[PDB]
Paper text:
Contrasting with Enterobacteria, members of the dominant genus Bacteroides often encode several BtuB vitamin B12 outer membrane transporters together with a conserved array of surface-exposed B12-binding lipoproteins. Here we show that the BtuB transporters from Bacteroides thetaiotaomicron form stable, pedal bin-like complexes with surface-exposed BtuG lipoprotein lids, which bind B12 with high affinities. Closing of the BtuG lid following B12 capture causes destabilisation of the bound B12 by a conserved BtuB extracellular loop, causing translocation of the vitamin to BtuB and subsequent transport. We propose that TonB-dependent, lipoprotein-assisted small molecule uptake is a general feature of Bacteroides spp. that is important for the success of this genus in colonising the human gut.
Numbering used by the authors:
A (entry chain B): 27 to 379, 388 to 660
B (entry chain A): 49 to 95, 96D, 97 to 257, 259 to 375, 380 to 415, 420 to 681
């Protein structure tokens, strides 16, 4: 009588909406346990919405190995460095089948125990606990050259055409102590050029912007909590700045880095946001929605959606989680029981297994003039350095094509979008939907599915003349706040370019109000004012809504209005859709239109919040239901 | 006979049953004790520790000829260290171990495994007994043995045992690259299992005047290779482990006339453990950890009988356990046990009590815990030998020296666990007719509670495993066993035996789902088969003896999570053997042919440590 059966996982796989901008596949490498070789490589396909926990074993009919340490996607291949098995699985990207088996072995049969991989000019450079860095060609997949970098190595990175390898010396803790060195390797001659005295036990190492290398150094004792973060200037290969904040690992975008610390005595874990230029912490807790964190195993950053992926390992015995957070720290989703100790999350956009097609997801932006804000003059504002306004427009069309989020800045900043075909009028139900990056908090002060609401007024117009140009008459949609005392019609605001480039941006209105939109340390571009604007003063005209953000401390909640506004609600689960029948004219009379072509979105709320800046309407991608 | 009258749950294998249980290094015969969950490694010469009733594997105490041996470094004791060439009687006690005349270290352990050494008989004339038991086969296994016995002064006898056990042990195991069914598979050979055991023993039995002054001098040098786990795509290990265990043991017994029996035990044990890993990536070129252990053990147990049927025991102990390495701990321990109202009454209560207290002075804990034990063997129905048994026992683990003084991975503030056991059982035996000379069946439903369990949890950095008191395992299993010998016609004994265990060992450490160990609540613990069972069949014919023994273990899991991804499949280990004795001018030759793992099943009991397949073992023995 064997009543012993595999009891299920009980909790569902995904505990949130699984949406991501421009990411096709997302691969999660899970270590498993030492001497138990139950490592795995899971994937999530956002296009097919398909979750595969045992993807490598489902493909090649063989397990990945023991303690798979690193994963990286390069040149339509996935390179998986597996430590105890001492292998590098170099599996093909569109098929998922393993193409070649690289043996990371020494002259004898002893394992090199490789840990991490870095890429520079179609060579994969792999560091090991043997103290060696190996160069592997991406074509023949053979070990071409071995260099000795001294003691045991843990992570490797590429910057300024040089490999930085963190010589940890971890296994020598009972003997001569941990090593204190980061080795620098040139591409051209491929010898060890310099050895940087960095601090004891250097671990995770990553390049950043402004041509620098950030490395985490542990203590002589790991449990002692003597962690530091070292900025190394790649010009001189010397220790530039030593930050005393406790780090286990970190993920870098722009000038900021999301880093977690994890003590081993009290088991206390914290995830902070850090400014790599100012050198100070900004938020002592990254998770600002009340989502409990217990054991963050590693932290990654999506290179082309901006989200932060923190994996959970718990007691290092049960299957971990993968939690996706936004830039503000609200949880987007989490994959539950994705694998045993999920180590490293990598991302791709090329998928596995057309602009001329309509595809029900709009075609091209016609007008884009945003107000100054925290997201302006960055990659999410369709701007790069030294490009004119038409270049900003065609980058906006390109970002709309790749389903990337576009921001509108402060109050009054507007965007105008069309479609491949005219949307027919559906009577009695909704016509089109606007996708937003708003996420809901599980508990707020009030109800109505609160969270981060950034409401915006939508307008629609019909291409009656048929020229494809936004010169037709604009009709405002009557929302839930329309016609009440909670809205301020005929509001004219103007923004002034500050005389310092990096200054707070001044705005004045016709209602007697004067104020600023403030600089925050997250977004440190040249100016919050739009750089492709040639005039000093810009003005915007429209209806101002009542401010919906309420100070509860550092936990500001944008309370959602019921219906009729863009980026007011999360993009699924009702009240984010729109119909033509809400459109009214200037005089407020109801106008019935048989078809519709032009959708205009501008920000309805003029409010500063603080560390999340102004209320900014972010448009993901408009889409019709027909 | 025994195994029925015992108040605590006793199982016993005599010399002919251990003959029928074809095995070497003891732990392959331990697997048939009907409650034992063995944690094992690779094949010959692997680490083979024992859990009594799916308790901790450090809650057991194995006793080599009247004194328990105590491994302090990783206190899971190597059972495969002891060999089966000189074992007269093997026995497992789940409790008080029947009689209260033991040294105090036998008490306060949740189960003891008693290995008894061959006591020589010395039949009339014949001063000298010579025995050799040369065993060979199974991929380079060789095992010569010597058993020089000599009577000295009609009360002194001397037994010198020698055993060289060189081995190769390359098993043709079958490696699966995964856990599901559609997995590519490989036929790989096991590497680095070179075992080179050597055992020497000089035991002196002094039957003075009743009075015994049994002594033993034991030496054990080994050079076993320690194989790694079968990691995928990589099997090259060079780990060597040298053991140099030795001890000198003394056992004095005196019967000071009526109402007084006195006993002294003494033991000096020196152990050496050299672990070499030349493939390790330490910058000096490999780890060379050496551990030195010493145990000074003394006991002055006494027994005083109030009447002919009732007895008390006062057992005082003493132990100095020193350790050196490459910090350098020393544990002073003092046990004294007062056995309570032990009655040995005819058709009424056979109740017994025992309170043992312990005192350790170590920079560590200084515990003075009291441990009770009650064992009742109430027996109605005088016409048949049917016993009702019930024993409550609260024992506790001590934290090992690897759990306290390993290089800053082990905690220093470990709470020393618990083991709370409430076994209740029915034991029946009959000798009806002559078609069945002996029948017996014994069913014990037991409830073991472990609290504050010391567990090694990984940390996924340097000094990987760390000790923590995170475990509250509740065991509620039931263990049945049977021994049925039937004799058809004449001289054709068809001696059968069997055992079964419905082990329900659920981890109940934290009931809330919002916890890392809340997914482990009401879940089976890691290496514990639910429906573990065993069986034996001895066929005694005068021209050829045959024996069969099979092991069944159910769906063993991994890590306590209980998902199908970390499932281990149920296995069956079937084995057969043949025995023959020849009388050649008063010299007894013995030929033995053993086939182990008869169905060639490549199974694992601990993950990525595959057990050997079909092996053939040939034994040639010369007696006198
Ligand atoms: O040049 C880049 C390419 O070179 C190598 C290989 O074919 C690809 O993986 C890609 O990385």
């Amino acid at each position: 009588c064997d009543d012993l059966e595999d009891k299920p996982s009980i909790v569902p796989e995904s505990n949130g909406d699984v949406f991501e901008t421009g990411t096709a596949e997302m691969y999660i490498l899970s270590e498993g346990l030492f001497n138990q070789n139950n490592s795995s490589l899971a994937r999530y396909s956002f296009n097919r919405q398909r979750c595969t926990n045992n993807y490598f074993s489902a493909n090649n009919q063989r397990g990945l190995g023991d303690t798979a340490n690193d994963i990286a996607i390069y040149g339509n291949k996935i390179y998986v460095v597996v430590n105890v098995s001492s292998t590098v699985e170099v599996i093909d990207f569109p098929t998922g089948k393993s193409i070649r088996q690289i043996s990371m072995l020494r002259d004898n049969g002893s394992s090199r125990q490789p840990r991490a991989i870095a890429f520079d000019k179609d060579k994969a450079y792999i560091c090991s606990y043997d103290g060696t860095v190996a160069r592997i060609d991406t074509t023949s997949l053979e070990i071409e050259e071995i260099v000795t970098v001294g003691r045991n190595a843990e992570d490797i990175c590429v910057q300024n055409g040089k490999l930085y390898v963190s010589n940890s010396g971890g296994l020598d803790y009972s003997g001569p102590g941990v090593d204190t060195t980061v080795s620098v390797i040139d591409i051209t001659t491929f010898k060890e050029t310099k050895k940087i005295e960095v601090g004891p036990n250097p671990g995770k190492i990553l390049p950043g912007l402004e041509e620098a290398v950030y490395v985490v150094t542990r203590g002589t004792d790991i449990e002692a909590g003597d962690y530091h973060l070292v900025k190394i200037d790649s010009r001189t290969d010397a220790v530039a700045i030593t930050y005393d904040e406790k780090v286990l690992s970190f993920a870098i975008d722009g000038p900021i880095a999301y880093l977690y610390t994890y003590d081993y005595q009290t088991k206390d874990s914290a995830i902070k946001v850090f400014d790599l230029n100012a050198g100070t912490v900004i938020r002592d807790n990254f998770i600002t929605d009340g989502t409990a964190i217990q054991t963050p195993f590693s932290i990654q950053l999506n290179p082309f959606s901006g989200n932060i992926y923190i994996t959970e390992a718990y007691n290092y015995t049960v299957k971990g989680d993968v939690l996706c957070f936004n830039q503000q720290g609200q949880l987007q989703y989490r994959l539950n029981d994705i694998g045993l100790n999920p180590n490293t999350v990598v991302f791709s956009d090329k998928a596995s297994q057309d602009p001329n097609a309509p595809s029900a997801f709009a075609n091209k932006v016609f007008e884009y003039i945003p107000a100054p804000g925290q997201f302006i003059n960055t990659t999410t504002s369709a701007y790069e350095d030294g490009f004119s306004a038409g270049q900003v427009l065609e980058h906006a069309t390109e970002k709309l094509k790749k389903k990337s989020v576009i921001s509108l800045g402060g109050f009054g900043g507007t965007i105008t979008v069309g479609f491949h075909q005219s949307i027919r009028n559906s009577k009695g139900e909704y016509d089109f939907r606007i996708l937003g990056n708003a996420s809901y908090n599980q508990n707020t002060g009030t109800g109505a599915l609160g969270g981060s609401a950034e409401p915006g007024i939508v307008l629609v117009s019909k291409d009656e003349n048929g020229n494809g140009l936004p010169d037709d008459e604009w009709y405002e949609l009557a929302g839930s706040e329309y016609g009440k005392d909670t809205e301020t019609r005929n509001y004219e605001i103007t923004y002034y370019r500050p005389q310092p480039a990096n200054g707070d941006v001044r705005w004045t209105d016709n209602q007697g109000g004067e104020g600023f939109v403030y600089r925050n340390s997250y977004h440190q571009q040249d100016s919050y004012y739009p750089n492709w604007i040639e005039e000093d003063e810009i003005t915007f005209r429209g209806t101002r809504l009542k401010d919906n953000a309420i100070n509860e401390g550092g936990t500001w909640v944008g309370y959602c209005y019921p219906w009729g506004y863009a980026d007011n609600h999360p993009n699924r689960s009702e009240f984010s859709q729109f119909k033509i029948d809400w459109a009214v004219d200037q005089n407020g009379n109801h106008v019935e239109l048989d078809k519709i072509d032009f959708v205009k979105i501008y920000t309805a709320v003029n409010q500063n919040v603080g560390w999340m800046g102004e209320i900014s309407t972010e448009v993901m991608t408009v889409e019709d239901l027909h | 006979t025994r195994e029925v009258r015992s108040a605590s749950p006793l199982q016993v294998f005599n010399k002919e049953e251990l003959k029928n249980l074809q095995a070497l290094q003891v732990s392959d015969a331990v697997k048939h004790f009907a409650g034992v969950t063995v944690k094992d490694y690779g094949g010959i010469g692997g680490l083979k520790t024992v859990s009594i009733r799916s308790l901790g594997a450090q809650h057991t105490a194995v006793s080599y000829d009247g004194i328990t041996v105590s491994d302090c470094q990783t206190g899971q004791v190597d059972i495969g260290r002891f060999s089966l060439n000189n074992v007269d009687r093997l026995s497992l006690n789940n409790g008080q171990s029947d009689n209260i005349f033991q040294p105090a270290r036998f008490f306060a352990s949740a189960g003891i495994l008693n290995i008894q050494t061959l006591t020589p008989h010395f039949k009339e004339d014949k001063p000298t007994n010579i025995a050799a038991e040369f065993k060979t086969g199974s991929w380079g296994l060789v095992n010569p043995s010597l058993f020089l016995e000599q009577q000295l002064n009609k009360k002194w006898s001397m037994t010198a045992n020698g055993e060289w056990m060189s081995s190769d042990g390359h098993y043709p195991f079958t490696l699966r690259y995964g856990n599901d069914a559609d997995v590519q598979v490989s036929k790989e050979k096991r590497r680095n299992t070179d075992v080179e055991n050597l055992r020497a023993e000089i035991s002196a039995f002094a039957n003075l005047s009743k009075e015994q002054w049994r002594l033993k001098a034991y030496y054990y040098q080994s050079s076993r290779g320690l194989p790694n786990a079968t990691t995928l795509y990589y099997d090259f290990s060079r780990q060597n482990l040298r053991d140099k265990n030795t001890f000198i043991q003394s056992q004095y017994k005196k019967e000071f006339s009526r109402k007084w029996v006195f006993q002294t035990s003494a033991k000096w044990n020196w152990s050496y453990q050299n672990y070499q890993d030349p493939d390790a990536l330490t910058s000096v070129g490999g780890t060379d950890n050496s551990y030195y252990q010493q145990e000074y053990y003394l006991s002055a147990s006494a027994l005083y009988r109030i009447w002919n049927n009732l007895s008390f025991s006062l057992s005082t102990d003493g132990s100095i356990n020193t350790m050196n390495a490459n910090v350098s701990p020393t544990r002073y321990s003092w046990l004294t046990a007062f056995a309570g109202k032990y009655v040995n009454e005819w058709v009424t209560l056979s109740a017994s009590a025992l309170a043992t207290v312990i005192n350790e002075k170590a920079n560590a804990g200084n515990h003075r815990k009291l441990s009770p034990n009650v064992s009742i063997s109430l027996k109605p129905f005088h016409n048949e030998e049917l016993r009702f048994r019930f024993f409550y026992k609260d024992i506790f683990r001590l934290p090992s020296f690897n759990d306290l003084y390993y290089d800053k991975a082990g905690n220093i503030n470990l709470k020393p666990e618990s083991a709370t056991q409430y076994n209740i059982g029915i034991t029946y035996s009959k000798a009806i007719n002559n078609f069945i000379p002996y029948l017996s069946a014994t069913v014990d439903a037991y409830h073991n509670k472990v609290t504050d369990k010391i567990v090694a949890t990984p940390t996924k950095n340097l000094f990987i495993w760390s000790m923590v008191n995170l475990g509250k395992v509740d065991i509620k299993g039931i263990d049945a066993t049977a021994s049925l010998s039937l004799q058809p016609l004449d001289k054709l004994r068809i001696n059968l035996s069997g055992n079964y265990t419905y082990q329900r060992a659920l981890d109940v450490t934290n009931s809330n789902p919002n916890s890392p160990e809340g997914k482990v609540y009401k879940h089976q613990i890691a290496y514990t088969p639910r429906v573990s069972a065993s069986g034996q069949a001895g066929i005694e014919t005068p021209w050829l003896n045959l024996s069969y023994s099979f092991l069944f273990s159910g769906k063993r899991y991994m890590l306590g999570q209980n998902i199908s991804d970390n499932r281990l499949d149920s296995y069956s280990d079937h084995s057969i053997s043949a025995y023959r004795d020849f009388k050649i001018q008063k010299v007894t030759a013995s030929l033995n042919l053993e086939v182990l793992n008869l169905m060639n099943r490549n199974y694992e009991i601990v993950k990525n440590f595959p057990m050997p397949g079909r092996s053939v073992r040939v034994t040639i023995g010369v007696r006198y």
